[PDB]
Amino acid sequence: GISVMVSRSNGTVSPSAFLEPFSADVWVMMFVMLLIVSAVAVFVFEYFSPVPSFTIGKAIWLLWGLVFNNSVPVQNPKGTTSKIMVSVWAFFAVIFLASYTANLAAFMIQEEYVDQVSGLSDKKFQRPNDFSPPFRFGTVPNGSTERNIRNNYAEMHAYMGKFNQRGVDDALLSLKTGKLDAFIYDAAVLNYMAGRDEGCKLVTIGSGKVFASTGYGIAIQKDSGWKRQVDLAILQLFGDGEMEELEALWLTGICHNEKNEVMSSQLDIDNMAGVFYMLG
Amino acid sequence: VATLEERPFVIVEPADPISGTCIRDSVPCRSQPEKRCCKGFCIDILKRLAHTIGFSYDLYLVTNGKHGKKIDGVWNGMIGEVFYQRADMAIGSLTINEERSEIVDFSVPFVETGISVMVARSNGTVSPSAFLEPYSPAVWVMMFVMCLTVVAVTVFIFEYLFTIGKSIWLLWALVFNNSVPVENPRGTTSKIMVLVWAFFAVIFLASYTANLAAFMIQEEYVDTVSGLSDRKFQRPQEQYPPLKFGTVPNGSTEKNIRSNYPDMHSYMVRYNQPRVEEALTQLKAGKLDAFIYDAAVLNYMARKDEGCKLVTIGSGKVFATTGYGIALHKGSRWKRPIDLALLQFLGDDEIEMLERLWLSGICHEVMSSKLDIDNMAGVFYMLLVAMGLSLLVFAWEHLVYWR
Amino acid sequence: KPTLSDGTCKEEFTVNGDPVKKVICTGPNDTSPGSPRHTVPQCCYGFCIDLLIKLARTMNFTYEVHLVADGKFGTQERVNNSNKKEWNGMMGELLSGQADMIVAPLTINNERAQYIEFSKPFKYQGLTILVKKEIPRSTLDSFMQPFQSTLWLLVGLSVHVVAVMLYLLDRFSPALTLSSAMWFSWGVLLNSGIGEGAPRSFSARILGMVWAGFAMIIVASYTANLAAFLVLDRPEERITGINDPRLRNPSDKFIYATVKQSSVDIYFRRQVELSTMYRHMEKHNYESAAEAIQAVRDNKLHAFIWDSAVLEFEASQKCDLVTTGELFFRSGFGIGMRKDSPWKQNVSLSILKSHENGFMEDLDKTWVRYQECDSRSNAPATLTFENMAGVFMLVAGGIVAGIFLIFIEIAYKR
Amino acid sequence: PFQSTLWLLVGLSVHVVAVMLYLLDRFSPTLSSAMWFSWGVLLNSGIGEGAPRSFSARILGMVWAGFAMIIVASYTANLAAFLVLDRPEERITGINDPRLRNPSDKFIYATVKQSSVDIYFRRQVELSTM
Amino acid sequence: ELFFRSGFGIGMRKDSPWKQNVSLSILKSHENGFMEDLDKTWVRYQECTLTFENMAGVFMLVAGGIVAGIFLIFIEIAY
């Protein structure tokens, strides 16, 4: 068909990862259980027991600190019976933090990313002169995968005049450096080139997605007599499984670009953005 | 030629009575009558030899015995018939031996085989030293020397504008998180000094929990028992729980044991089973504990299994390896065209291709387990020496105070 | 779909408000085996009938749809007298003369191409296996899972063992209350902020050194082990392509079928090496691809082998199932016509022009690629209130314990 | 896991709120005291005795603790994520590997002259490319 | 993975008279366990984390903080 290649250096980060574990419900009921214990503490356990004053403000603050590790100095309530009650709440906090990290490790071991574009129908290709430094793409002229674009997207074919590489080999060299950011070529050579690159540094949009699917052929002379004999031969190879042998012998690569297992990441300013918005 | 039925090598199935003839891709097996198809790994070899050499054959299942045994003068089974000129070859799963090869000459082995042990897979286990095993000795060698240096700086500088023991309780306690009340200095420089050591504590706490989790998620399975040289197999009556193991009689794996460990052989007699498929239910039901049989069958039966709960000792350790073969008539003169034909297949990859077709399966793994006391019992010994260490300090101070 | 009263199709609209296009199908009713067939008008619509209307405008002809007689696809079978073999079903009616254009999903292979003429494929497919998706399951109801119950009792016992020994060791050294020292050990384990008593004698100080480090090892290991039950909990029971060993040698515990008299039967017989498992199919082949899918949902069938363009639409709407394997026989569809027909050239050019314009990439959008259930993106386990109950009840059910402690503490006073 | 750009803002974000807390609590019915209060939370050290007497600082202190907790928990996950997902694949997986049957002119592989690997390779016609 | 399995073997001339006893004294060494001694004495006896490395960055600032602290002490004393 027609396919798209990308650098994969950017990919997509995962923002708002802090709220990925737990749920919106557990936090809401966490506050009400944060205060029911404190309200009974001042009014029942401390006031109805012997041995200046333990105000309600200290009770909510003291019971809060243990949730996110005790680091602020505070004054504990008196009374022998009031000691055990706080210890019961403390054991809630120890497990509460322990499970949160354990669940957080599950999400970042099997993280899934999203490609930076959706296809040729995305606005980044249709109308590029509206953004940050413009998107780059280009294709080798004098073929089909450029005749097809010259009929349907004649608006954006003008923008591709300056970017015109001179073959697949030269363009894949300049795609990593940064001269251009996208490559548009028939989806049977890009898949092989993607699957035969060291380090899996280049991935194809959609992981095997074609955009105007037309096969190959053997362009016999018109009005020939061989056409009915050749066709039966090719339709025969599929039945015997011979073609499945040739595809394994020649069209096989080493990089398994289908898998999206990202080998960790270094979180940057943009990645942890939701946390700072809570601070604001 | 003669042939017996071993399930993964020669499979016997009744002929389809609708057509009164055998199926496609099979050869007739005229029992000694009847007539039925028979296919498998060993039979698939037979057709290839008859192609590049050229001869006529007629398989027939042997009925006298099983695989060959001596009754003090006579032989029965596949070896029994060939030795007595009632046949020519005897293809199948016929293990090369010494007592056999003195009377009938075999061919080049084409499958590797020995004696191995099959036991039931159990719950996964981690090393008891997991509390400190994933850490190098260099980590704690230099860890405490930093603490001693810092505690000397804070006390000495406290004079310039706090006992030695108070420095131990304060600076150290930050590494294991703040959970014990401590005394702190109130000097404009001393406060900054504590902050530096605190930061390393968070990293140490962050690093410790990650490595212990990562090391434990993926690891290697812990073996249960070593080979036949283990004292349990050799001397079973010397342990309070008697181990239960046995083997199928009348074969090579019985005569090999009888001539090497006669002390063990006299004990295994009561633990016998008359088949292979019958004896693998006992392992599932816990009646037995181990099985002793030729490796090429146990390796296959450990893959064609539901749940993959059976593994072999040593992950495929083979003892007294002797391959398979094709018997002959001790003078056959057919031997050289057969020796030079088998070796040609290994030059190509035709024999390797067959092993994927028949002798293959799934689940050629790790299991999560609760820690329990035993696995973490190692870290408890750290506690025990500490309690003993207090007594040593208590006695030393008490004696020196007296005089 | 059955027609409305007065013989007309029911009015309808799509999600975007476009009125769907429908034709009139005159086909058999209640085509059950051993039953008479009665012809009644129906209503037909979908992918191909959306394509058929497009051709019928460009080339300017006029159509008249009618469903197949029996309901099969097409194969060659022997007659009783000698072997004057003939075709059957939808493939045979084109040769007889009762139909002139087989607008339907019809794979192209060498057996059929010797009698009729196909067009350029309008969809590229393969063969893949559909198997039942087992429950992902979940093991989180109580927090006593990472440690065995034999250790928490011992650990709690060890707390009282160490705590009592501070008072004995420190007091005998030539002071702090034992009850005060009781909260020292508890404070370390729970990371709480209560308790003020601390050892003073160096004999007791060295005792408290290790116990502080013991609390860190136990909790860190617990929170490390809880990661194991979130990345290791996954079974592995699936078929890997056609070459999976479970498929070569059938067992009575595994059964797998296809649709009778289709292209797959021609595929499974032309090959000769795979002639030992197809013989087990001949006693289980189903009657319609819309029925074998229902049988799998009832656990009466384990595997199903069919076209990859249908099994990946059912696997989305009926998300109880998931498709496994790798495509192993790729051949596009085709609008077959009788050999030597006048229209045989302009149809093959009004399909090649529907690929480039973005048309057949637009029918694909509105019929085959609307999403209803997500897929199995590994085993994501988010935490909800239902999972954690033991912790929530202990804090909720432990508040009444403090009521008892007050009544006995005041009793000791008087 | 965190680049130097992050640590550029960490050293100022904690410091900037310190003066703000001193501003809010003082003018309601010092700088050194608030500096130890905020920083100690991040490192989990019980330093200083300064407490938020004003209610405004307490509620701000409450949310401030949550900011520190996420940093510690998230960072631990990143470090544990690297060890498991770290494998610079360079294995050849034996024969039939595409890197072996089709040489790149830089992946040079050899054997010993004569021997029995040469006899094995020459006989098979399909092995004439390598 | 192993891809050409063929065992070793003693060579002999095509007409040597010892072939009937060399080929047996090897078939008897396998069963006595003899060649599981040679496999132990000569072949299977030799078997060759965070550590100090990967953490020298924080090691130096501990002394670096000491060095930075000492210089400020003179300012404290002078003030």
Ligand SMILES: *[C@@H]1O[C@H](CO)[C@@H](O[C@@H]2O[C@H](CO)[C@@H](O)[C@H](O)[C@H]2NC(C)=O)[C@H](O)[C@H]1NC(C)=O
């Ligand atoms: C191989 O071993 C056999 C016996 O296992 C040998 O046969 C005997 O050899 C001795 C040697 O002088 C003779 O005295 C005997 O008469 C032989 N026969 C028997 C039955 O003992 C044979 O010689 C050995 N082969 C070689 C080449 O030495």
Ligand SMILES: *[C@@H]1O[C@H](CO)[C@@H](O)[C@H](O)[C@H]1NC(C)=O
């Ligand atoms: C493409 O066509 C143009 C126009 O004829 C020609 O100048 C050019 O050499 C051709 N090839 C390339 C790679 O541009």
Ligand SMILES: *[C@@H]1O[C@H](CO)[C@@H](O)[C@H](O)[C@H]1NC(C)=O
């Ligand atoms: C082994 O051979 C003996 C010889 O008589 C026979 O009695 C016994 O039943 C055989 N064991 C079997 C068939 O399991």
Ligand SMILES: *[C@@H]1O[C@H](CO)[C@@H](O)[C@H](O)[C@H]1NC(C)=O
């Ligand atoms: C096919 O299209 C060409 C183009 O005009 C026309 O001349 C011809 O008559 C058409 N034939 C059929 C069978 O539609």
Ligand SMILES: N[C@@H](CCC(=O)O)C(=O)O
């Ligand atoms: N497959 C294309 C390659 C050339 C191109 O896409 O520009 C062709 O031969 O027409």
Ligand SMILES: N[C@@H](CCC(=O)O)C(=O)O
């Ligand atoms: N198949 C081997 C071993 C049989 C057995 O151990 O029972 C043989 O016939 O000699």
